[model samples]
Target: SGFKHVSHVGWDPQNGFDVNNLDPDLRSLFSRAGISEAQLTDAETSKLIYDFIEDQGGLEAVRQEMRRQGGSGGSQSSEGLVGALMHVMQKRSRAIHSSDEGEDQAG
Candidate 1:
């Protein structure tokens, strides 16, 4: 034999803060960078994020910054924006090293 079905419920935000309403600094940066939070899905945001990550000096150059942020003291950083960033950059870095038809792209 089995018991009768029990009740259940669910909840979530219908939506989040609109991009224009998010913040001024963010808006300014987005404008300067030419990418708007208003236009990106979470997946697109993920892809765009590492363009931030691998800029200027790239992965190997981030050792000091990562350690300062939260790295556990290694050539690799396991901390802060860099840590989350490296999860993406790390894979790209490997792919570049592993591939032959590659330009001098930063990780």
Candidate 2:
């Protein structure tokens, strides 16, 4: 039906997935990705993200990065969506990171 591995991460986009159901971090990624109901309903964006995640060696890869970057690793909740979205946003150069952009600039 939809992307096979999408379900591996515990997502069920066809029936129960809702952007509002996502936590703040995941929601932020979707917001940055320009996600909308129309995009999600078709599963295209989901597939795209799945493929991208798979390319990075599937969920374990993201989890590795998560651990490397000091992201939570013990909880069996929300990491799938959050990790995948993190990579997507990173690939697009939209992932949140510490920067001096908002700080006062040196003249």
Candidate 3:
């Protein structure tokens, strides 16, 4: 188990615990992403991270990306990762569709 402070920047995924507290991995992830604690609505922040995982080759890509470190954070690499994520998200269709739905529904 890991300790999670109240992020004030990002929301921790709710797991029958304190809504303000974060899980260790999620806390690490928010820290890694430089996410602010509870800056956005809890649902919004959690959804954004969910969106990231869904877009970025799902959990597997996250694993791969997490495995990566101390390498070039070059534009070329960024393009590759982003492009790959785009391709994956495009393949899923729901990601695009749902965001579209959100816009349409809200408007």
Q: Write the per-residue lDDT of candidate 2 for residues 1-107, one digit (tens) a residue.
A: 67455323444456333544544443343454455544433354555554554565555555554444444676443445555565564553442333465775476
lDDT of 2 at 83: 58
What number of backbone clashes does candidate 3 have, counting pairs of residues 3 or more apart or in separate chains?
A: 9
* Ordering by TM-score: 3, 2, 1
lDDT of each: 0.37, 0.48, 0.42
TM-scores for every candidate against the unseen true structure: 0.25, 0.36, 0.37
Clashes of each: 0, 0, 9
CA deviation > 4 Å runs, candidate 1: 1-18, 50-107
Per-residue alpha-carbon lDDT of model 3 for 1-107, expressed as tens digits? 79743323333455222325544433344444434454223454445555565555555555455446225564222334444434433433443212233345554
Give the lDDT of residue 107 in candidate 3.
40
Candidate 3's error at 104, in angstroms?
30
- Which structure is stronger by lDDT: 1 or 2? 2
Local lDDT at 44 for model 1:
38
Report how far residue 10 has shifted in candidate 3, in Å. 17
Pairing residues by index, what is the TM-score of model 3? 0.37
